[PDB]
Amino acid sequence: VLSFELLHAPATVCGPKKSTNLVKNKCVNFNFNGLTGTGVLTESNKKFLP
């Protein structure tokens, strides 16, 4: 038996893992980790911090 618990505790691990390939240089409707939008995705020479 695999049973769940329900209370006011915060969330934890789950089962999204929404995987879809990446298309560039086209007007597409994108949805990353938590931020959504529409536009064209290309390559950049800007460097982030890790």
Binding site: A9, P10, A11, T12, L49
Partner: protein
């Protein structure tokens, strides 16, 4: 002695979803035991800077 003169920002290390309540705080150091100070935790211990 005394903190240096400068600026330096601090990067994140880890976030934990534990969700317990924290109100107190205490720290852990090294208590040397050797031939100089023998015995239990009550007598045999030097501090260290």
């Amino acid at each position: 002695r005394d903190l240096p003169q400068g600026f330096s920002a601090l990067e994140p290390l880890v976030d934990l979803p534990i969700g317990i309540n924290i109100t107190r705080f205490q720290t852990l150091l090294a208590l040397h035991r050797s031939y100089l100070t023998p015995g239990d935790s009550s007598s045999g211990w030097t501090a260290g800077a």
